[PDB]
Amino acid sequence: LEVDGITETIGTTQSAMYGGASAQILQINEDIKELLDGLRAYFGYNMIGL
Amino acid sequence: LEVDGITETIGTTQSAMYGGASAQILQINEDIKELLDGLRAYFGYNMIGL
Amino acid sequence: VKAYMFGIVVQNPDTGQPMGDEFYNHILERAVGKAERALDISILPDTQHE
Amino acid sequence: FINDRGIKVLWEEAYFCPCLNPDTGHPRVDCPRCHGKGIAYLPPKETIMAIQSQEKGTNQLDIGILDTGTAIGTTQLEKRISYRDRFTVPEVLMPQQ
Amino acid sequence: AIQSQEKGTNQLDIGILDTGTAIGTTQLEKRISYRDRFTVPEVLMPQQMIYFVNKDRIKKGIPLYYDVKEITYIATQDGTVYEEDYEIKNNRLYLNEKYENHTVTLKILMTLRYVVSDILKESRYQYTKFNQPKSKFENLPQKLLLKREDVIVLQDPY
Amino acid sequence: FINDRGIKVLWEEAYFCPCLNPDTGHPRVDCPRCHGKGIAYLPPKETIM
Ligand SMILES: [Zn+2]
Ligand SMILES: [Zn+2]
Ligand SMILES: [Zn+2]
Ligand SMILES: [Zn+2]
Fold first, then answer.
1. How many other C-beta atoms can be found within 10 angstroms of the C-beta atom of residue E62?
2. D74, D79, D83, D89 alpha-carbon torsion, rounded to 10°
3. Nearest residue, CB atoms, B17 vs list A6, A8, A18
4. B–E contact: 3+ Cβ pairs < 8 A
5. Rounded alpha-carbon distances, angstroms, from residue D86 to D55, D74, D81, E11, E54
6. Where along this sequence does the record place binding of Zn(2+) (chain D) (predicted)?
7. What is the CA radius of gyration of chain C?
8. Which of D69, E40, E86, F15 has the fewest CB atoms within 10 Å, i.e. is most exposed?
9. How far is the centre of ligand 3, averaged over its atoms, from the C-alpha of D29 (Å)?
């Protein structure tokens, strides 16, 4: 936006593909993956005898 | 921003894909991977006799 | 922790207040839990009855 | 955009003072409602205005020095500023001798 | 910060004069005022002088037009003048009475000097809020128009 | 950059000639040190401009 030669301009983290919080969600998903691997080592694999 | 003959332009490390601390987190993940390989060599593989 | 970020401060841009050490202690206690699950170990001393 | 970029100003609205001499048409120099200017001003109104090119415009004359400086102002929306309306900028102090 | 440092030579029936002009940008948070004076001790400008030397000027010393910092050349009809035969004190030139009917010519250096003639941007402003407890008003750099000190010439401040 | 782009010139430095008339203030038109100009010149210096 420009008025009378004062100019203000923004590029935001939004884009036609990626949402404003894309990067944070990707990092949170990585952390979730590590946590789930650890906890799925603490609790065992399910098994049953037929 | 341009105001009365003063102009500033900034590009940040933030982007629609990557968060501002992406680089540091990636390097820290590399260090964690090296450390975990070393420590999983110090402690052994788990084993049990069925 | 802060030693590894020498020359940075984490600071609320609306108030200038630095982040409280309570969050650091909370994060450390969870990071110890994570380390105790990435490796099949007990780090901090505790009495076990089996 | 204007509220971000503008400085806070006090706006007061001009009108001709009713002290003008009914014959000569000039202001009464002792008038308390206007201090010898022909123009009286309504009570001030708080507004934000963006201001540019704030020139001092020094002049040196046989009568003495004078300032004729000029600036360009962009108003807020939905305002009808009128001729010889007056602005003051309480944040900004100018040196004089 | 200084730009467009023009000499502005004028040649007149009264003699030569300098009316040169420059543009200056101040530091933050300063309120420069009309006819404030600047000197630039790093920057030396060349100037020229000539005087007829007479018994009064021998006894009293020639009051120099410029604030001479140093002499680069000095000569007379008889040739170069050696440093044992001249002295400068208090911006007066003293000569050996040998030269009581001579004319002396000089090349000199003097410090650059300016006076504030007009202020092209006397106010620029910003409310700054980012990382502050509350909004702080700050005064941005002024733009000055600077005119050179030829007509009336004053000593350096030290 | 300047040495590549400039042309070679001879520079000679001005000073007022001491032939100026002590009363009228004007140059002597017959002066050999300056050919009627009020300005004498020092020996030339080679420079690029
Ligand atoms: Zn089970
Ligand atoms: Zn084992
Ligand atoms: Zn009145
Ligand atoms: Zn001559």
1. 21
2. -50
3. A18
4. yes
5. 17, 14, 10, 46, 64
6. 17, 19, 31, 34
7. 16
8. E40
9. 8
First to last CA, chain D: 37
Q: Do E140 and B6 touch (CB under 8 A)?
A: yes
Experimental approach: cryo-EM
Q: What angle do CA C35, C37, C40 make, to 5 degrees?
A: 105
Among all residues of chain A, which has the CA nearest to that of B32? A34
Neighbours of E147 (CB within 10 A): 20
The answer to whether F34 is a known ligand-binding residue is yes
β-bridge partners, E109 = E46, E70
Which structure tokens are listed for D54? 């704030």
For residue D43, the CA-to-ligand 3 centroid distance in Å is: 15
- Determine the length of chain A: 50
Alpha helices in B1-50 (DSSP H): 22-42
Containing F39, the helix (H) or strand (E) segment is strand F39-41
A5: left (phi over 0), alpha (psi -120 to 50) or beta: left
Token representation of residue E150: 């030829």
Type of residue numbered D5: R
Query: Nearest ligand to the C-alpha of residue F31?
Result: 4
Q: How does A10-35 read in b/e, with b if 16+ C-beta sit within 10 Å?
A: eeebeeeebeeebbeeeeeeeeeeee
d(CA E91, CA B43): 88
The DSSP string of D15-55 is EE-TTS-TTT-PPPTT-SSSSSSSEEEPPPEEEEEEEE---
Give chain E positions within 8 Å (CB) of B4.
121, 124
Indicate the residue of A5, A13, A24 with minimum beta-carbon distance to B16. Answer: A13
